[PDB]
Amino acid sequence: SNAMNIQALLSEKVSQALIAAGAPADCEPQVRQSAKVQFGDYQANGVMAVAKKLGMAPRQLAEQVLSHLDLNGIANKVEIAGPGFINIFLDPAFLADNVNRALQSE
């Protein structure tokens, strides 16, 4: 009944989906708090570097990562923007629960 670190969780999961799509095991998803509210809560910005190393189009890779990424229960919406940014909008019930877990015992 212990809370997660959301950014670290998203990083782990984007990292795995990148690896399933062909990324090196030590690839960096570059998950950061979204730059603007219209880009969700977090963005994964590391697809373009991976795509280049792998010699492929970054939007093509991004779509591949999404086919491996399962954020049901966690994100209400996962969108691809520009040259393969991944924009993640959290489930409000997930956030509220995670925060209730963190403060449980308060």
Curated annotation (Swiss-Prot):
Transmembrane segments: none annotated. It is found in: Cytoplasm. It comes from the Bacteria. Belongs to the class-I aminoacyl-tRNA synthetase family. Monomer. This is Arginine--tRNA ligase. It comes from Klebsiella pneumoniae subsp. pneumoniae (strain ATCC 700721 / MGH 78578). The gene is argS. The chain holds residues 1 to 103 of 577 of the full protein.
